[PDB]
């Protein structure tokens, strides 16, 4: 009975035959990443991934995709974080992100680790996902900056955080977006992303072509006239940036 594709604004999609009630429910449903090639294929209920196995979208006939399964028993499920649990599988990487970025020492002095591109990509490419626990703006804005190194606003109601000890990739590597450092001249942006495992989160997307082994940076976008409400290191850099202008 034919096949539906639902594209999110970020370029990922859900694809499959819908059931009698018109739900994306079945054994042969897939989520396809924004490369229109990497896919998680298997059992979904009402568009929610129950058992998605890593696959490649090879071709499409009369609108109907063909998937070849990748080796391994890489399987994924919808596993939205809570305020305390960042993931059921903190050490299981996202397979699309794995092929595109890695973590290494930042090239920015005294900035710890940073996120780097594995491959040359063009503009508008989703590179990495910023998943974390979900907490409130009230909580975040009421606590010390020391606790807010990794907080990223998701929307008016929710802030995503990667709190200790999940700021170390030895404890958490299911996503890596929290490892991109700040620049006032960035090559990437944060953008909304609907992820079949993490749910509604943000991703890191290039705004220009990037080379292999280039460090990926984003503007953190703190309020410069709430001086700035920002960590001291950012305040130093903001002064330098305005000076160059």
């Amino acid at each position: 009975h034919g096949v539906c594709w639902i594209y999110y604004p970020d370029g990922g999609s859900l694809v499959g035959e819908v059931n009698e009630d018109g739900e994306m429910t079945g054994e042969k449903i897939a989520y396809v990443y924004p490369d229109e090639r990497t896919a998680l294929y298997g059992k979904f209920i009402d568009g929610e991934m129950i058992e998605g196995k890593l696959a490649t979208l090879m071709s499409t006939e009369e609108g109907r995709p063909h998937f070849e399964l990748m080796p391994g028993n890489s399987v994924y499920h919808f596993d939205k974080s809570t305020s305390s649990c960042i993931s059921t599988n903190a050490l299981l990487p996202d397979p699309y992100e794995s092929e595109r970025v890695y973590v290494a020492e930042s090239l920015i002095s005294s900035a710890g680790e940073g996120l780097f591109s594995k491959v040359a990509v063009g503009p508008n490419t989703v590179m990495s996902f910023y998943n974390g626990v979900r907490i409130t703006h009230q909580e975040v804005d009421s606590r010390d900056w020391a606790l807010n190194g990794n907080t990223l606003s998701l929307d008016e109601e929710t802030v995503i955080d990667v709190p200790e000890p999940y700021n170390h990739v030895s404890k958490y590597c299911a996503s890596l977006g929290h490892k991109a450092n700040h620049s006032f001249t960035p090559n990437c942006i944060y953008d909304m992303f609907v992820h079949p495992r993490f749910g509604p989160i943000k991703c890191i997307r290039t705004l220009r072509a990037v080379e292999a082994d280039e460090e990926l940076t984003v503007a953190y976008g703190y309020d410069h006239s709430p001086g700035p409400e920002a960590p001291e290191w950012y305040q130093v850099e903001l002064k330098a940036f305005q000076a160059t202008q």
């Binding site: 975040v140 907080t151 976008g221």
Partner: peptide, 7 residues
């Protein structure tokens, strides 16, 4: 406001 990328 103690988080990145607020609208």
């Amino acid at each position: 406001s103690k988080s990145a990328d607020r609208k």
